Amino acid sequence: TPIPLLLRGQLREYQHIGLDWLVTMYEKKLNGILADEMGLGKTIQTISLLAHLACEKGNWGPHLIIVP
Amino acid sequence: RRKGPHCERPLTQEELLREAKITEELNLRSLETYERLEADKKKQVHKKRKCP
Ligand SMILES: Nc1ncnc2c1ncn2[C@@H]1O[C@H](COP(=O)(O)OP(=O)(O)O)[C@@H](O)[C@H]1O
Ligand code: BEF
Numbered sequence: 001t002p003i004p005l006l007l008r009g010q011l012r013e014y015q016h017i018g019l020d021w022l023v024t025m026y027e028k029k030l031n032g033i034l035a036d037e038m039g040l041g042k043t044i045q046t047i048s049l050l051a052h053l054a055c056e057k058g059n060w061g062p063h064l065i066i067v068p
Numbered sequence: 069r070r071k072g073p074h075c076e077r078p079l080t081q082e083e084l085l086r087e088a089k090i091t092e093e094l095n096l097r098s099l100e101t102y103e104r105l106e107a108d109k110k111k112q113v114h115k116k117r118k119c120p
Binding site: 006059 | 086
């Protein structure tokens with residue numbers, strides 16, 4: 001679960017561990033809040049989760065991102 | 069009688085096709101660079117002048 005997929009400009013420590021936690025939640029079929037404080041790149045962690053799941057859990061589905 | 073199911077062309081995704089479509093999306097990123105650079109807005113000149 002701590003592994004980057006087809007992605008560029010790789011993560012720093014907490015972002016990589018967060019990617020690991022996110023795909024761990026996905027694997028246990030859980031849903032989560034990444035309540036990381038601002039600037040920890042929770043966008044980038046989510047993008048990396050997108051990539052990881054796309055390459056490793058079959059194929060990508062249409063993830064919908066609803067944002068301000 | 070006038071049925072239209074459109075079951076034809078039942079296209080599906082595959083892992084070999086995955087990297088090909090990723091390849092064209094990498095080219096789409098390269099194209100995005102042309103959106104990342106910028107040019108100017110092309111402002112316009114003043115109105116025509118009266119002469120009676
Ligand atoms: N791991 C990272 N490596 C390189 N640049 C990053 C990283 N995380 C964030 N950045 C840059 O810093 C900015 C902050 O990321 P951001 O998406 O605002 O994080 P958050 O939304 O969680 O505050 C982004 O615009 C991004 O370009
Ligand atoms: F953590 Be952020 F501001 F998306």
